[PDB]
């Protein structure tokens, strides 16, 4: 018997205020300028 | 018997306030300019 | 037996105010000006 | 009999202001210019 | 009979502020520039 | 001055032949049974 | 001056045959079930 | 002056042949029964 | 003056045949069950 | 003048065959059931 519980994954976990660049959470590939 | 339960992915956890650049919760490919 | 429940997936789980950017929950491919 | 709970995973835990740059969870490939 | 519980990995901790670079939680491949 | 040409993204490279399954490029929730 | 060309993102570079089960390039949520 | 090119990114470089489970590239989230 | 050239990332080189099991590049979250 | 050139990085070299398990590139949090 097996169980898995309550597990969590957050890539931000608070607040995000007044940026004037780039947040990406997950990026797979891809050309990022900021 | 197996059982997974109350797992959570959160990209954002938290208020975002006045950005003036770019949020992207997942991205693949592409580009991004901010 | 098995069973998955209760699972959730969310890219912004608090408000989004103010933006004068570019907010995308998921990108595929294309092109973002910010 | 097994059991895993209260496990979690977080890229940014407290809040993140004012960047000028690029903040990215994870990434996989790709480029990023900041 | 095994369990584990309450584990935390944590990439960001406290807060970010001012970032004119880049920060990135994990990274495979790809080409950082800052 | 910046630029980025000649990016490309593409799900299935090859051809596809006599499937009796299922071929999702991109799946976002839904319910697949193959 | 900065610049970027001939990046590519291939999830499938090269034949798919005869499958009978499920074939995501990208999923998000959902249930798969083969 | 700065350049990147002839980067790649390829989850399956090679043919997939007679699959009768779940063959997925990208997942983020969601439940996988194979 | 910096380059980057001829960068690669490759999840799977080879071919894969006959999977009755699950194969995933990338996996963010979500459950698997093979 | 700095440069990097013909870096690679592989998950699976060779060839997978016949696996009723699972087989994950990589894996960021998560359940898997093998």
Tied chains: 1, 2, 3, 4, 5, 6, 7, 8, 9, 10.
Excluded: C, P, W
Aim: zero cysteines.
């Amino acid at each position: 018997g097996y169980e898995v519980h309550h597990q969590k994954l957050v890539f931000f976990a608070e607040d995000v205020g007044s940026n004037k660049g780039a947040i990406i959470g997950l990026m797979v590939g891809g050309v990022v300028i900021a």
